[PDB]
Design a protein around this ligand. Structure first.
Ligand SMILES: N=C(N)NCCC[C@H](O)[C@H](N)C(=O)O
Ligand SMILES: [Fe+2]
Length: 336
């Protein structure tokens, strides 16, 4: 259910060399300079890869695009960080650039004023004490399936994930719309504006740095949590709908029994068709955030310097779609 590409050694080396050159020339990934240049620099990537990315993006069926075979030297990389705050290590630097280059073939990258201090290139890694939270730094508790930033109309079209390391093979989970089992009445209800989708816990003040707690954009998160507006779960074509739902943060509209039954049914059908995608070291996946929901299986964290670690990036097909949420910065979204 995903499109797959495997780099040849020559292609992988060329891509790595390009990223390393970018890392030498630009101060950081999230600076305005590299954000503007990356989409043009990505034109220098191996031709066969560019062809795959162009064609896979135009395909109507896949839930994700996967590129296998980027080399990652664990010794050069260094230890997995204890927190995302300290995670921009020299060892991971070139791979962050590589991820942004691939992302540049698919769309415009952005972040959130209220998640990981407004960073564009973010980190997924287990944090000690947060094993049973509902955020991506969980471990022992399975990360429930969701549309990334399901609450927001400016959520990504694609979610990019590059696996820096994953020694114990922990699976990302994926599921599409369970179209073979949804009856037309239930389908009809899911297409109607009868559902509440609150922001997930990654947007909470306590999950950002103490110096950021005063940011005005947290007010907008509070309003979305306190007073969510009724929206549809399914949109577009009835035979190939787009999907907007979060398994832990969605609810029916108040007193709406038909919507409740429809959401209950959907949960059950998504649970039943959830499948696994293991991102091994050096794998990059771009998950279609409109066709599919995703999560991550429960795992026992190591906390020994070699924990599973991904770089992550939100991607949109059109940055100008979200101008209302441009928070004094077009690549960092949030509202009063
Ligand atoms: N537990 C759920 N159903 N949803 C939580 C949302 C998870 C997202 O990836 C979030 N941006 C994060 O990184 O924590
Ligand atoms: Fe996610």
């Amino acid at each position: 259910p995903w499109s797959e590409f495997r780099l040849t050694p020559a292609e992988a080396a060329a891509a790595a060399a390009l990223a390393a050159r970018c890392a030498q020339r630009y101060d950081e990934t999230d600076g305005p300079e590299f954000l503007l240049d990356a989409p043009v620099i990505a034109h220098e990537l191996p031709r066969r890869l560019r062809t795959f990315m162009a064609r896979a993006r135009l395909d109507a069926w896949p839930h994700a695009l996967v590129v296998r075979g980027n080399p990652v030297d664990d010794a050069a990389l260094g230890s997995t960080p204890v927190h995302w705050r300290t995670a921009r290590t020299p060892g991971s630097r070139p791979l962050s650039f590589l991820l942004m280059l691939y992302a540049g073939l698919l769309g415009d990258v952005f972040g959130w004023a209220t998640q990981q201090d407004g960073r564009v290139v973010t980190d997924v890694l287990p944090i000690k004490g947060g094993e049973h939270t509902l955020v991506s730094s969980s471990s022992r508790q399975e990360l429930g399936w969701h549309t990334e930033d399901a609450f927001s109309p400016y959520r990504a079209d694609y979610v990019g994930l590059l696996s820096l390391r994953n020694p114990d093979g922990v699976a990302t989970t994926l599921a599409g719309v369970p179209l073979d089992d949804l009856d037309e009445r239930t389908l009809d209800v899911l297409f109607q504006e009868r559902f509440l989708i609150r922001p997930d816990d990654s947007h909470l003040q306590v999950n950002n740095s103490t110096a950021q707690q005063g940011r005005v954009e947290f007010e907008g998160i509070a309003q979305a949590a306190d007073r969510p507006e009724p929206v549809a779960i399914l949109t577009g074509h009835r035979a190939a709908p787009h999907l907007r739902v979060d398994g832990d943060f969605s609810a029916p509209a108040e007193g709406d029994e038909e919507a409740a039954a429809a959401l209950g049914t959907l949960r059950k059908l998504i649970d039943a068709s959830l499948y696994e995608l293991v991102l091994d070291q050096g794998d990059v996946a771009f998950i279609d955030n409109r066709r599919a929901v995703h999560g991550r299986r429960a795992f026992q964290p190591r906390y020994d310097g070699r924990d599973r670690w991904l770089k992550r990036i939100n991607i949109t097909r059109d940055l100008h779609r979200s101008r209302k949420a441009w928070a004094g910065d077009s690549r960092v979204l949030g509202q009063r």
